[PDB]
Amino acid sequence: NEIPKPVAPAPDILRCAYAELVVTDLAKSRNFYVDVLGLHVSYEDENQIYLRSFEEFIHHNLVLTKGPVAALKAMAFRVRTPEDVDKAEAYYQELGCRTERRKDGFVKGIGDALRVEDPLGFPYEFFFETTHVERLHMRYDLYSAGELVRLDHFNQVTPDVPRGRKYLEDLGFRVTEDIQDDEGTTYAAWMHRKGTVHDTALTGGNGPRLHHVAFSTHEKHNIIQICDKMGALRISDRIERGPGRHGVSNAFYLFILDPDNHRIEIYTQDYYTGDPDNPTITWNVHDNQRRDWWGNPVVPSWYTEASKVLDLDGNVQEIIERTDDSELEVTIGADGFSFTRAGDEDGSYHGQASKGFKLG
Amino acid sequence: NEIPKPVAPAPDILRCAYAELVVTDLAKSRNFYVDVLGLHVSYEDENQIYLRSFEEFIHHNLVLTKGPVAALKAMAFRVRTPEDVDKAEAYYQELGCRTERRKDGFVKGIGDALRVEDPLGFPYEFFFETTHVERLHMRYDLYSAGELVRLDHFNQVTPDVPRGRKYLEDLGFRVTEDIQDDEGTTYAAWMHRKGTVHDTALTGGNGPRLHHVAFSTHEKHNIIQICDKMGALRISDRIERGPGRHGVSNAFYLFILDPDNHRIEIYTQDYYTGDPDNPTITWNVHDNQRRDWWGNPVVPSWYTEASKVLDLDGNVQEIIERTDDSELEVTIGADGFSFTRAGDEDGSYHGQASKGFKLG
Amino acid sequence: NEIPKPVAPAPDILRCAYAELVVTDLAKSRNFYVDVLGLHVSYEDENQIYLRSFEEFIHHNLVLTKGPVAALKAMAFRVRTPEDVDKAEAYYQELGCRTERRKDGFVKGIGDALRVEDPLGFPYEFFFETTHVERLHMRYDLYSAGELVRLDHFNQVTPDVPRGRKYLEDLGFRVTEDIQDDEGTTYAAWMHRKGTVHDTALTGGNGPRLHHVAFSTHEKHNIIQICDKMGALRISDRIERGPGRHGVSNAFYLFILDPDNHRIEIYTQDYYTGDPDNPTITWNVHDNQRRDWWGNPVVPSWYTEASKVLDLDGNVQEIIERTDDSELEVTIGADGFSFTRAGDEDGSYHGQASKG
Amino acid sequence: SNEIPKPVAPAPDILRCAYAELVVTDLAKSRNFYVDVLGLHVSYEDENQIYLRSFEEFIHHNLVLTKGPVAALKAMAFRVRTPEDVDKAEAYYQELGCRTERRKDGFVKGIGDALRVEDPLGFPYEFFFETTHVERLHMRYDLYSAGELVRLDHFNQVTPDVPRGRKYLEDLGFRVTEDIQDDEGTTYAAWMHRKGTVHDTALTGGNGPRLHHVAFSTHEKHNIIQICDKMGALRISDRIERGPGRHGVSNAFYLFILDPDNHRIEIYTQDYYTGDPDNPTITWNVHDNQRRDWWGNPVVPSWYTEASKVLDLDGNVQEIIERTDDSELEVTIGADGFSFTRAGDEDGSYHGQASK
Ligand SMILES: O=C(O)Cc1ccc(O)c(O)c1
Ligand SMILES: [Ca+2]
Ligand SMILES: [Cl-]
Ligand SMILES: [Cl-]
Ligand SMILES: [Cl-]
Ligand SMILES: [Fe+2]
Ligand SMILES: [Fe+2]
Ligand SMILES: [Fe+2]
Ligand SMILES: [Fe+2]
């Protein structure tokens, strides 16, 4: 069931700007994002923490909101002009979606804002106006050895990737890289507005769920330092996967889990995608260098676990089951297969993960 | 069982200096060590390749010798003076070990040398004299993105770690770190002469076998580049384990396998151990940050696979079985366990490895 | 002398894309750019070498063209669509500028291209069509310890910075950072299309001349390696300035000199500027942390030396003298002044450069 | 005949440089520099002293800041291998005719039995073995700073007659690794080691005795860059004296900075292994412009002429003896000096002038 291209013009989206995450214990979450990860506090009170990255000038990149059920409450994109908020509203209304408009914003530091239940069941916000704050990009007196310098992207779990992909292309995101097989199945797609590999991405699975939010560092050693620090704090069990080099994106990466199991990616040094004919790279799902370029196995939790998302009323969205093939199953499951070198049996894996591991 | 301390004085050992490895196909080994890893050729012909690291001034750190069966032929330590080779000869004769003395060396670029079949079945060489070559430490016109700058250590698999440790202590090696359990079994020990964490190390297991030879890089990014390069060359299947941060040693590391399955470690940034009261560090075998500080699982091959070693006639030394508990079995096997925080059930793994994998 | 805003719509410029440099000895230049700096050859013949950075997919980022006088021949920007090359043509005509349009390109690997002598006397090219090549961004088998990964920007020397700034703003470039004094003089401005600090910059001085072309590395150590390699090759005399951390741009940098003295910057880790209200940063010209954040002195040659530029016929553009104050003279000349802390005499410099 | 005769008494077995005691005039300002700016770790403090250690250290401290009226080095301390080596050090310096002081309970907190001496070159050396062990912070990445100082690496002493001091240090078991000489036979500097790095101390030709600097190492080059960046952000870039750079001698990445009393601190990383007894000694020509900074960056005159006072055992300032051998400053960057990039080549050489 294809999502039609509206007649109304798409809003001009600049970039991913922030996420609002609902958390169950604010103090424990603050300890994770401020004390462990070093994000900068823009505002806080008893109910909310507003956090930003080292180079950000908008009010925040992350809002932690106390609530009963941990979930993604909104993924927010900044648009180019105030008038793009009107465009967003008309666009989503034509798509048949629920929309909510607040002239004074939903969260502090954001002005006129539109939140929508998009056609994949995701809570998207579009805004232009935001309170500028001190841009800390040269505050080396604050710089941490693991400093998170920007918000980079979101990653969304959704059951039908081509359906979502077409809708995001209409909205103006261009696909930079994807994962497919020779039987017609799409497992994942990465798409951008701002000229990095992505602003959001679709990962095939039961959804809507939020796979992760990603922040970048300047250098690879900053990511290693996050791991080293987590060991020193004796919370290495909260390192889910990595560090590694991605095939898709070519970025150095790490996946870690917050106190409510919301997944955060730390990412650095992908490439420029701003040209309109930027070459799209398609990887085969059975290529064992596609997710970790060094062939390290992808733990099953990476495929199966992700965050609930909320509707505009704050209720959890119902999960829709993926009927397409499962990336986990076709690569590391019982009938799974992966290769190091296409057409070579040597360095291939049958019914198990790479490097001597099987599904727990 | 105990190896008695000789009356004769121990030779004064400076450091690990080189290893002679037998390889089955010299051209494929050359491609690995020179083309992929960038070691520098000191001499080569149809029978052998002599290699050194970027900062070395003695003739070589690695001798690749063509032969029928891939194996360790000699692990060589440089001693402080010519007279120390005579001391080594009297010491090992008093231990009742087979010795062989050659006034003009066993390999090119080494003069007066003593090879011995040591009490643990290992072929050790001791020498002083060596041919000096151009020290390439400032040849940044040659420097690779993955440059190996020094030879750091060896690691030996032996069935009885305390027996081996005591013998190495009598030789003047001082233990820096070890791994034990609460019921008094030792699984591994690291010991040094030069003022780093180790020059050699003992891993509990069936032996004698050589676990690995280790080279250093200057920085962590150099190790990441070795991985990246192996991905580009589509030999990621030869990355056995890593990259990571060690617990023991605190060094950043990677383990890779040469064309004959000889294991090479790439290592950087351990600490100073030259003071005679340098504090020892004992880890518990079930501490999941002891080998990889980030808790990443140790691949089973790391525990079970190792190189054959040769006796002084070039025949393979018979293997003696370990009867103490297995590190693999007590940590990641069906009956094993490991913890992130001592005492804490959260972040503990029972009957499987960390991060969600079981043994393949 | 104000350059009027045309009625015709400006072209939609994506980014700086390539420079064409005339060089006098193709072999010596090849050695510098390929052997020393490790740039990748897309094409080469007896008269020209076409080079690209590690992550590029268009044909080239740099064209070295043999000729009698070393100079900038074209600074090229890619536009979003084929129809934007028409927009660029109608725009520069209305500006009264000389233009030349070639459906098959001026250099190999570029299709329909427009060249112009712009109102500041610089040879700009606008194009969409380019021959795609193998993007080498994951070819870590080729990756050098000093690897240049992207083309980042150009920097132009021009006598009147406000004049040039207004023209580039009308053209769609937004100022990210600039250097001014409290007497109303502007010494420099940086401006962007692609969302880094700049695609081009204006440096106040006698012009038109090209100050430098800049390539990125992934990390700071890659720039260090470039220096270390130049010492090993015993060509450290071709390191002009750096390495350092910029005040303006916040980027780690190095300036070196090619065999014809064309200045090349290596640059890494500036910040994101793609929001349309990106805060502009204005530095005072006397702030000694503005160019080198660590306060290292800027050598006079950096201010006085720059490359000649050619007009559309291949002749050197005549240089027009700057009449506004000189950044060299007001900071490090005999009556110069700079400070470490605004208002503090301690750590200030009178009539000389910082650090002794 | 001015020679320092080798004693018949055996030399103490010296392991490494271990700590320095620096007298500072304003303890709070000094604490801000060493703790807040540089990130050293507090091992003990009170209203008179601050005891500080690096990230990987297990002995009590690497730096003792002592409040006093006149900023000076009070002691440069080396750890010896055994308690009996302190007895050896006493017999050895007594035979040299040096003034000595033995305190069985130490001179500073966390050190036990210790000997201080006014050595033949006028420097206050300490020899101890006994020290209180503390928590080794090597894996405390929860404390690790972007600019983390991980070890104490070395001292550098200014002395007028380098061969005279060098032979005295060789007798004490220090081995020269590198030096700087000219064709006429003058020695300008020498570096010498006990522990297996390029040096534990070094001698710089000049008026002495003065302490040139104390040096700490970082893990990687980016940690040094970060010190510079932090000092820029704190607007104290005027306290960055020289660097950052690649050294010729030692091949280490380096930075020189100045504490509140103008004590010079080097930050240093990635020299090479020197533990073999026939470690090749490297001699550089004083006119080689890559010997100090490998990239050819000039050495600011203050690096050659400024250094800290040292104290005698009563706490008074040691009188200075002026160098009569040729001055490295004068022969390289002074009115009659010169330096080269490539030996014998006028291109890239500097006459009566520093580089760049
Ligand atoms: O650059 C120089 O001045 C030579 C040099 C080398 C090593 C050092 O530790 C040092 O202080 C000085
Ligand atoms: Ca198939
Ligand atoms: Cl992935
Ligand atoms: Cl290990
Ligand atoms: Cl600048
Ligand atoms: Fe991601
Ligand atoms: Fe090892
Ligand atoms: Fe620039
Ligand atoms: Fe030094």
In a domain, D194, yes or no: yes
Q: What residue of B is the nearest CA neighbor of A251? A: B228
The Cα B79–Cα B57 span in angstroms is 15
The Cα C229–Cα C211 span in angstroms is 24
3-state secondary structure of D117: strand
Q: Residue D301: is the preceding peptide bond cis (ω within 30°)?
A: no
In a domain, C51, yes or no: yes
Question: Which pair of structure tokens corresponds to residue B29?
Answer: 């080994």
The one-letter amino acid code at D24 reads V
Report which DSSP code applies to B54.
T
The one-letter amino acid code at C352 reads Q
The Cα A74–Cα A117 span in angstroms is 10
The verdict on whether residue B183 carries a ligand-binding annotation is: yes
SS (H, E, C) chain A: CCCCCCCCCCCCEEEEEEEEEEECCHHHHHHHHHHHCCCEEEEECCCEEEEECCCCCCCCCEEEEECCCCEEEEEEEEECCHHHHHHHHHHHHHCCCCEEEECCCCCCCECCEEEEECCCCCEEEEECCECCCCCCCCCCCCCCCCCCCEEEEEEEEECCHHHHHHHHHHCCCEEEEEEECCCCCEEEEEEECCCCCCCEEEEECCECEEEEEEEECCCHHHHHHHHHHHHHCCCHHHEEEEEEECCCCCCEEEEEECCCCCEEEEEECCCCCCCCCCCCEEEECCECCCCCCCCCCCCHHHHHCCEEEECCCCCECCCECCCCCCHHHHHHCCCCEEECCCCCCCCCEECCCHHHEEEC
Q: Residue A208: is the preceding peptide bond cis (ω within 30°)?
A: yes
Question: Which pair of structure tokens corresponds to residue D169?
Answer: 């240090």
Entry field: residues in chain A: 360
Q: What residue of A is the nearest CA neighbor of B342? A: A234
Closest CA to A200 of A186, A216, A214: A214
Closest CA to C145 of C205, C77, C79, C224: C224
Question: Most distant CA pair in chain D: distance in Å?
Answer: 61
Give me the number of domains chain C comprises: 3
The Cα C232–Cα C238 span in angstroms is 12
- Evaluate whether D138 touches D51 at the Cβ level (below 8 Å): no
CA of D131 to the centre of ligand 9 (A): 25
- Evaluate whether B162 touches B185 at the Cβ level (below 8 Å): no
Q: Ligand 1 test: best mutation among D151, D199, D247, most atoms within 8 Å of CB?
A: D247
Which of B147, B221, B233 has the CB atom closest to C141's CB atom? B233
What are the strands, taking DSSP E only, across D119-196?
124-128, 151-159, 175-181, 187-193
Which residues 60-79 of C have a C-beta within 8 angstroms of A?
A: 78
> Which residues face D6 on adjacent strands?
none
- Evaluate whether B197 touches B175 at the Cβ level (below 8 Å): no
In a domain, D82, yes or no: yes
In a domain, A83, yes or no: yes
- CATH code of residue A239: 3.10.180.10
Residues 6+ apart with CB under 8 A from C95: C3, C4, C6, C118, C119
Neighbours of C (≥3 Cβ pairs closer than 8 A)? A, B, D
Check C140 against B225: CB less than 8 A apart. yes
Instruction: Please identify, among C234, C262, C288, the residue that sits at the C-terminal boundary of a domain.
Output: C288
The Cα A165–Cα C302 span in angstroms is 50
Atom 1 of ligand 1 has which residue's CA nearest to it? D292
φ, ψ (nearest 5 deg) of residue A214: -120, 135
Residues D258 and D311 in one domain: no
The Cα C250–Cα A218 span in angstroms is 12
In a domain, D95, yes or no: yes
In a domain, B1, yes or no: no
Which is the closest atom of ligand 1 to the Cα of D199?
9
Residues A193 and A279 in one domain: yes
Atom 2 of ligand 1 has which residue's CA nearest to it? D292
Residues C252 and C166 in one domain: yes
Residues A280 and A247 in one domain: yes
SS (H, E, C) D55-96: CCCCCCCCEEEEECCCCEEEEEEEEECCCHHHHHHHHHHHHC
> Which residues face C203 on adjacent strands?
C157, C188
- Domain of residue A239, residue span: 150-288
Instruction: Give residue C142's Cα distance to chain centre.
Output: 26
Instruction: Please identify, among A118, A149, A180, the residue that sits at the C-terminal boundary of a domain.
Output: A149
The Cα C71–Cα C94 span in angstroms is 27
The Cα B337–Cα B331 span in angstroms is 5
> Which residues face C158 on adjacent strands?
C204
Which of C14, C274, C278 has the CB atom closest to A275's CB atom? C14
CA B129 vs CA B85, B102, B199, B326: distances in Å? 10, 12, 19, 41
The Cα C253–Cα C211 span in angstroms is 15
Which of B140, B229, B232 has the CB atom closest to C229's CB atom? B140
3-state secondary structure of D110: coil
The one-letter amino acid code at B341 reads R
In a domain, B225, yes or no: yes
CB-based contact, C276 to chain A, within 8 Å: yes
CA contacts within 13 A on the Cβ side of C207: 27
Place of tokens 């040269």: A138
Which is the closest atom of ligand 1 to the Cα of D266?
11
- CATH code of residue A304: 4.10.1270.10
Q: Which ligand has the nearest atom to the CA of A154?
A: 6
- Give burial (CB, 10 Å; 0-12/13-18/19+) of D320: middle
Q: Residue A259: is the preceding peptide bond cis (ω within 30°)?
A: no
Check D146 against A141: CB less than 8 A apart. no
- Evaluate whether A77 touches C274 at the Cβ level (below 8 Å): no
The verdict on whether residue C56 carries a ligand-binding annotation is: no
Instruction: Give residue A148's Cα distance to chain centre.
Output: 15
In a domain, C114, yes or no: yes
The Cα D242–Cα D224 span in angstroms is 12
Residues D256 and D305 in one domain: no
Place of tokens 């002599």: B50
3-state secondary structure of D237: helix
- Evaluate whether D220 touches D268 at the Cβ level (below 8 Å): no
Radius of gyration of the CA atoms of chain A, in A: 20
- Give burial (CB, 10 Å; 0-12/13-18/19+) of B217: buried
CA of A303 to the centre of ligand 3 (A): 10
Q: What residue of D is the nearest CA neighbor of C346? A: D238
Contacts of D234 in chain A (CB under 8 A): 141
Question: Which pair of structure tokens corresponds to residue B251?
Answer: 């060094």
> Which residues face D301 on adjacent strands?
none
Residues A257 and A296 in one domain: no
Entry field: residues in chain B: 360
Check B359 against A356: CB less than 8 A apart. yes
The Cα C327–Cα C180 span in angstroms is 10
Place of tokens 């998302």: A309
The Cα D84–Cα D80 span in angstroms is 9
Which is the closest atom of ligand 1 to the Cα of D252?
7
The Cα A102–Cα A110 span in angstroms is 10
Question: Which pair of structure tokens corresponds to residue D276?
Answer: 């073999």
Question: Which pair of structure tokens corresponds to residue D23?
Answer: 């007298």
DSSP D241-294: EEEEEEBSTT--EEEEEE-TT--EEEEEE------STTPPPEEEETTBTTSSBT
Check B140 against C228: CB less than 8 A apart. yes
Residues C126 and C234 in one domain: no
Check B346 against A234: CB less than 8 A apart. no
Contacts of A150 in chain C (CB under 8 A): 272
The Cα B132–Cα C157 span in angstroms is 53
> Other C-beta atoms within 10 Å of A27: how many?
11
Q: How far is B24 from chain D (nearest CA, A)?
A: 33
> Other C-beta atoms within 10 Å of D105: how many?
9
CB-based burial, D273-310: b 16+ in 10 Å, e otherwise: bbbbeebeebebebbbbbbbbbbbbbbbebbbebbbbb
- Evaluate whether D110 touches D43 at the Cβ level (below 8 Å): yes
Report the pocket of ligand 1 as residue ranges, CB < 6 Å: D 156, 215, 247, 249-250, 252, 266, 268, 292-293
> Which residues face B15 on adjacent strands?
B78
Check A276 against C138: CB less than 8 A apart. no
Residues A61 and A154 in one domain: no
- Evaluate whether A290 touches A247 at the Cβ level (below 8 Å): yes
- Give burial (CB, 10 Å; 0-12/13-18/19+) of A169: middle
Residues B111 and B208 in one domain: no
Which residues 190-229 of D have a C-beta within 8 angstroms of A?
A: 220, 222, 226, 229
Let me know the angle formed at the C-alpha of D246 by D245 and D250, rounded to the nearest 5 degrees.
135
Question: Which pair of structure tokens corresponds to residue D273?
Answer: 């292994």
Atom 6 of ligand 1 has which residue's CA nearest to it? D249
**Number of alpha helices (DSSP H) and beta strands (DSSP E) in chain B:** 6, 20
Q: Ligand 1 test: best mutation among D249, D266, D293, most atoms within 8 Å of CB?
A: D249
Q: Which ligand has the nearest atom to the CA of C263?
A: 8
> Which residues face D268 on adjacent strands?
D217, D254
Residues A42 and A99 in one domain: yes
Instruction: Please identify, among C149, C178, C207, the residue that sits at the C-terminal boundary of a domain.
Output: C149
The Cα D355–Cα D299 span in angstroms is 9
Radius of gyration of the CA atoms of chain C, in A: 20
- Evaluate whether A173 touches A193 at the Cβ level (below 8 Å): yes
Report which DSSP code applies to B298.
P
Residues 6+ apart with CB under 8 A from A4: A95
CA of C13 to the centre of ligand 8 (A): 19
Q: Which ligand has the nearest atom to the CA of C214?
A: 8
Residues 6+ apart with CB under 8 A from B110: B59, B76, B125, B127, B129, B130, B131
The one-letter amino acid code at B252 reads F
Chain breaks in chain D following residues, C–N > 2.5 Å: none
Residues C197 and C275 in one domain: yes
Which of A224, A234, A299 has the CB atom closest to B220's CB atom? A224
The Cα C118–Cα C137 span in angstroms is 34
- Give burial (CB, 10 Å; 0-12/13-18/19+) of C182: exposed
Q: Which ligand has the nearest atom to the CA of C268?
A: 8
The one-letter amino acid code at A79 reads V
- Evaluate whether D26 touches D17 at the Cβ level (below 8 Å): no
Residues D188 and D255 in one domain: yes
Q: Residue D280: is the preceding peptide bond cis (ω within 30°)?
A: no
φ, ψ (nearest 5 deg) of residue C261: 75, 10
Report which DSSP code applies to D239.
G
The one-letter amino acid code at B31 reads N
The verdict on whether residue C345 carries a ligand-binding annotation is: no
φ, ψ (nearest 5 deg) of residue C30: -55, -45
Check C145 against B145: CB less than 8 A apart. yes
> Which residues face C151 on adjacent strands?
C215
The one-letter amino acid code at A296 reads N
- Evaluate whether D78 touches D16 at the Cβ level (below 8 Å): yes
φ, ψ (nearest 5 deg) of residue B83: -60, -30
State the structure-solving technique. X-ray
SS (H, E, C) chain C: CCCCCCCCCCCCEEEEEEEEEEECCHHHHHHHHHHHCCCEEEEECCCEEEEECCCCCCCCCEEEEECCCCEEEEEEEEECCHHHHHHHHHHHHHCCCCEEEECCCCCCCECCEEEEECCCCCEEEEECCECCCCCCCCCCCCCCCCCCCEEEEEEEEECCHHHHHHHHHHCCCEEEEEEECCCCCEEEEEEECCCCCCCEEEEECCECEEEEEEEECCCHHHHHHHHHHHHHCCCHHHEEEEEEECCCCCCEEEEEECCCCCEEEEEECCCCCCCCCCCCEEEECCECCCCCCCCCCCCHHHHHCCEEEECCCCCECCCECCCCCCHHHHHCCCCCEEECCCCCCCCCEECCCCCC
* Declared resolution, Å: 1.9
Place of tokens 């900062």: B55
Region of D192 please: left (phi>0), alpha (psi -120 to 50) or beta: beta
Percent of chain B as helix, strand, coil, to the nearest 5: 15, 35, 50
